[PDB]
């Protein structure tokens, strides 16, 4: 199922080097969420600080749509190793 859905997406001509297409040729809109985990080592001498966070990016890549409306298929598929995606 999931492995088949992935295979269907990359069996065609997909180039992870090419930017995702847009309807009006506009730019790819990347929504960003950010989760701070820890903020440590606030160095005042070197004026810097350490921080560990979780970066969360979300964009649309019509080329990767498999279910479209879906409602018969899984909402989403976890991308496994060995499958390149424009990022």
């Amino acid at each position, epitope marked *: 199922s999931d492995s088949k859905i992935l295979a269907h997406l990359f069996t065609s001509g997909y180039d992870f080097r090419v930017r995702p297409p847009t*309807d*009006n*040729g*506009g*730019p790819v*809109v990347v929504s960003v969420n950010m989760l701070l985990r820890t903020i440590s080592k606030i160095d005042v001498v070197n004026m810097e600080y350490s921080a560990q966070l979780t970066l969360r990016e979300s964009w649309i890549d019509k080329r990767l749509s498999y279910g479209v409306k879906g409602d018969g298929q899984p909402d989403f598929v976890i991308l496994t190793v060995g499958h390149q995606i424009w990022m």
Partner: antibody
Amino acid sequence: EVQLQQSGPELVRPGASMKISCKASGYSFTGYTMNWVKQSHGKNLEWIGLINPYNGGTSYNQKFKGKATLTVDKSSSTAYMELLSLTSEDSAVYYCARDGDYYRYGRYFDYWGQGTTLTVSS
Amino acid sequence: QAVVTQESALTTSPGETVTLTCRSSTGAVTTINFANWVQEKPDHLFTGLIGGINNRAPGVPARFSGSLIGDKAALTITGAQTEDEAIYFCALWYSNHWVFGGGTKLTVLG
């Protein structure tokens, strides 16, 4: 108060090339990027390009690529605009409009100049 | 290519609420269009009102306000004033450049 005073009106023959100025005052000149707008009688408002005083960096409208050349003189807080190969179509009023954000691009207009009227006719 | 469209002209009385709209030909006006609104008083006096994400020019009265009503950019003057009578241009950002509209000639009736 901030002010953008542009050069006076100019009359030039086709084929020639002239340069209009925009002297900024009342604000840290090198902190706000400048836009150039062309208001012609035949068309609407057109966006020519923009320049970052601090950076020297420029970005032109594909339309005016080669027609306009944005520069800047930090010492005199003045933004200049060259116009090459002037023709009938270049007869318009050229405004200079400041961007809104402080040392960053905000994509919104603050103050404009009074405008410079360029008349090109042989 | 891409064209911006505005009402040729609009009319309103002092105190009322008028709304100018800005339409994109490529589709719905989204946030990455950074809809800008510029005012032109007589004798070539241009000044910015709204733009960018949701920021405004210095001194722009509180009555002015921007939004994305429907699928086009809007500019709403709540409590129109006499001096508010001018030509309003809206500008959309398409990828790497600005595109202006035809402008709307707002008349505050006298």
